[PDB]
Task: structure prediction
Amino acid sequence: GFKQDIATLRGDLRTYAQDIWLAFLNKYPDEKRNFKNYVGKSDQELKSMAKFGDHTEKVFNLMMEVADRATDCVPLASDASTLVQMKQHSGLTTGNFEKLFVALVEYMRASGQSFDSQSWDRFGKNLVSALSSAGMK
Ligand code: HEM
Result:
């Protein structure tokens, strides 16, 4: 289920984080505009860029904490407010997060592993609802 999936992802988090983030950026190429330095680079090149690996892992470090603190795939209001108020998320709208979790769920469905893809789909929707409620446009 959802909780075990958190453990599975945390057991190889840098690799899962990079693979899911790349699935997101490759499914939605315009999303690279939010990072600038990722433009014009293949996956293997991005994986050799220090900030890509370090920032992407930290993204998923926090994502797993928010998932772990959720109840029935519904994140805490305080976690949603943190994601809205982060200076690094100044530009973002809920659409950016919706697309990320579409790609994450698609990644899990295509995976050979028994991820609870439906729970991650609910989590993505519930997180988008919470971000909107906490003031993200
Ligand atoms: C649950 C989902 C997300 C979580 C937990 C999360 C978390 C984080 C964290 C921890 C950082 C700091 C990284 C660092 O400074 O090393 C960060 C930075 C950033 N995030 Fe998010 N993020 C999420 C979703 C998104 C999405 C969907 C986008 C855009 C499509 C986004 C755009 C950015 C940008 C532009 C930065 C700063 C620039 C950069 O790190 O290169 N984030 N995020």
